[PDB]
Each structure stands twice: as C-alpha cells, then as structure tokens.
Amino acid sequence: ATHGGRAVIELREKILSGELPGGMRLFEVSTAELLDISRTPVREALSRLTEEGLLNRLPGGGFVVRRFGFADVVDAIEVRGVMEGTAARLAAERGVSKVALEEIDATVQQLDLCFGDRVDDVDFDGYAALNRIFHHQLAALCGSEMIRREVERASSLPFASPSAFLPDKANIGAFRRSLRGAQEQHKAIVAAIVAREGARAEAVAREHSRTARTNLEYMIREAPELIAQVPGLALIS
Amino acid sequence: HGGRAVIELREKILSGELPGGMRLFEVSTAELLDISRTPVREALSRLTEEGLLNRLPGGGFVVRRFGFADVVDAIEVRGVMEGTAARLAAERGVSKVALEEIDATVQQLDLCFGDRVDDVDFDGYAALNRIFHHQLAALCGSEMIRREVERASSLPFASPSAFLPDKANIGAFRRSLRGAQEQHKAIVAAIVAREGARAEAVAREHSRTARTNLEYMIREAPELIAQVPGLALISDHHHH
Ligand SMILES: [Zn+2]
Ligand SMILES: [Zn+2]
C-alpha cells in the first residue's frame, strides 16, 4: 500500500533471487538508484529488512546482505520452535479465554478436514494455508504483545516461517504423510494449554518445528530438486 | 551505533521525557533534539529495530508503552534464548579455547565476592556479568543463535545487567549475586559435560534472578524502580 512496503517487496525479491548476493554492502542512495525509487521508502525498507533479519547494519552506516548456509536454516527453524514452545507454555501457565481457545480449536477442526482415509490423502495446500493461521493464533494465545512480537520475529526469515517447508511443489507422498503426525501435535499443543500443562505444551510445540527440519533433511537426501522451492534456499544450494 | 543522536533519543525515551504513546516524526524530532536530520532519521530507525519505537502507518514513529508485565515477559524471552544458546553449546560441543575464555570470566566474577554474605563488588560484578552473557551467546559458534540472543537482550530492561546499576547496590541484591554466580558456574559445567537439558534449565532459571529482584523492588524498594535507567519509562499498575 505504501512506497516503503513496495520497496520491501522489491528489495526482498532481489535478495532472495541472489541479484543482491550475500556480503553485498547496501546504502540508501545507491539502493534507491538500483530500485529506481525515492530515498525515503528505501531507508524504511532497509531498516525493515534488518528487523526481518535479511540484512545487518554496518558500523559507520549502511547495510550488508546476510549470507546463509543449511546450518543457519536448521538454527532458524530451531529458534522458531523454541519461541512457539514459549508461546504455548505461557498460554498453559497463564490460562486462555474460552473465545480464544474456540478460535484456535476451529482452525484445528478445519485442519483435521484436510485428511482422508488413505495415509497420503492430505489436501497439502489447504493444510499449508490453515497451518499459517494456527501458528499465528498460537503466537497470540497467551495475550502478551511482547510474546506475540517475539514469536513473529523468530518466524520472519523466508525459510523460518511456519509453512515455508510446505511450498506447492513439495506436495509429494513423503511430505503429505508427515502432516499426520504434525496435525496430532497441533491437537496435543491445544490440549496441553487447555489442561494448564506448560511443560507438555512447550515440549510438543518445540518438537513440532522438527517436522520442517526432518523434511529439509528428506529434501537433501531424496529430493534435492525441491530445495529451490523453499523461499531463501535457492541461493544457499 | 548511530552516534550521539541514538544515545540522546534513547535517554529521552528511557527517562519518560518522550512518554509511551508519543508520536515522533523525523523533522520535528530533529528540532526537539537540536540535532541534524540525517543522524536523527537513522536513530529513529535504530530504535525501532531495538524495539523502543513502532513505525506508524503512513510514516513516522510511536514510543511503545510498557508495563511491569511487559518487563517480566522480556526477561523471560532473554532467559529462554540464553537457555537455547547454552543447550546448543552443550549438544554441539565447544572448543577448549572458547571454554577457557568463558571460564576466565567466571573466575574474575568469583573475585567479586568476599567472606561476608554482603561483601560483593556490585559494579564490578555487573560489568563482568555482561561479558559472561555475551560469551554464552557466542559459545555454540552459530551466528544465527548469537544474533537472536543479542536481539532478545536489546530492550533496556531485558539486558543481562539492566537491574544492576550503581544505584541498585542494596543488601538483597548483593546477596542475590552469590546464587547467580553459582548458576554461571553450573551453566559452564553443564556445557562441558554435554548435558543440554541441564544447560538449558539452569541458563533459563538464571534469568529469574532479574525477575525476582524486580518483584523485590516493587514490594520493598520502590524508590529503586525510578533510579534504574531501564525502568524509569515503565507505567505502573494504577497508570498502565
Ligand atoms: Zn504446524
Ligand atoms: Zn548472569
């Protein structure tokens, strides 16, 4: 909607495609010239992408495109899992309003409808979209804006987002099968929160993030053509 | 680090001179600080990245509002992230040189303590505590982990020695540093032993020292709250 927001989209696209490679130094004026836009939205975009974690600030001014390896991707997924586990634990310890529980339980019920009678019968893209909703609701459940922000910050890297490892091209039997266990975890997270069992809520929500890690390991081992389909992984490989 | 504009703007936010909910714009903020536009523009962006300001839709910024429950949540996030750094160092293994670096800090921290329970070099401990926590964030050797721990420690009341300014040198707090120092030793021992679950449990529990001391300030020393630079901006229960 804003010049700044469009600058963020264009700059993110250029970083993800490798047009602005890892290690490239970026400055407000020269980046505005490269994007063919005004200095002001570029200043905002460079700051927002530093908050997002695609860029680092340079000492003395300016920015630098971050470089990422597969070990960085694993660490980013682990941080998301740790923060989602914290949001689940605090919701369990503090208690959640019935309306907020009904909202997330409705998402869980819609997610159950993605599954059929055969093991690989899963509406993959439908699950990926509802999964995004479930994880946003989980981040907000305990009612703390400080917690919600931190969870969303830990989910902001292109490969760290909750459905990053569910791109449409990854709709294969091995990935569909893995969603059954992942959906049982969604149900267990909500049950643990309803039961006020914080240690369980944390353990399951953190373990849930290992589904994306295990699917990344599967891509490397058995389906390397899929690596380029996950946002941010094409340049790494 | 954005020079004097960042320092001046941060100081004004922390003292409550620019209160929570105040809208800030580049040009009018530069006029208020009597500083040129360029460093002020950069400072507003840096302080949004640090988490003290939010960007407004359509341009400009807004000072965030914080209550004591927000401070507790921020300390909890720092503890959770420090626990993650300790767990990953335990699981992955640390080079002997990196362990010797953090162990040297632990030994210097032990030198802060005398034979009487009250005998503690409070300011010396506060300074070396910052080094210990920065070293812990870096121990596993992952730049992703190090950057995230530092980001979770960027709010003024969330930093590892935020509650240890010179003006907070009181009996209950000096006495609390002894148990805190035993936790520093237990974190390192757990990492050396490759016991990740222990490393995480102790490092996360360590952050509850700042939480317990905040609860003590509210209950027994409310005069300290306003004298702790990172707590002056907090809105109390009656006003938040
Ligand atoms: Zn999920
Ligand atoms: Zn400490």
Author numbering:
A (entry chain B): 7 to 243
B (entry chain A): 9 to 248
Quote the authors verbatim:
The orientation B of the citrate was also observed in another structure of Atu1419 solved at a higher resolution of 1.75 Å but in a different space group (P21212). Here, two similar monomers (RMSD of 0.98 Å for all Cα atoms) are in the asymmetric unit and form a dimer, which in turn form a tetramer by the crystal symmetry with globally unchanged dimer interfaces (1553 and 701 Å2 per subunit for dimers AB and AD, respectively) compared with those from the P212121 structure. They resemble subunits B/C/D of the P212121 structure and bind similarly a citrate molecule. Nonetheless, their citrates are slightly shifted by 0.6 Å toward Arg86 losing the interaction with Asn221 compared with those in the P212121 structure.
Here, we characterized Atu1419 as a transcriptional repressor of its own repression in addition to two other genes (atu1418 and atu1420). The structures revealed Atu1419 to be a member of the VanR group of the FadR C-terminal domain (FCD; Pfam PF07729) subfamily of the large GntR superfamily of transcriptional factors (>93 135 members in Pfam database). Like FadR, Atu1419 possesses a characteristic molecular architecture, composed of a conserved N-terminal DNA binding domain containing the wHTH motif and a C-terminal effector binding/oligomerization domain. We identified the short palindromic region composed of 10 base pairs and a degenerated palindrome bound to Atu1419 and the N5,N10-methylenetetrahydrofolate (MEF) as the effector molecule disrupting Atu1419-DNA interaction, allowing the expression of the second part of the HCA degradation pathway.
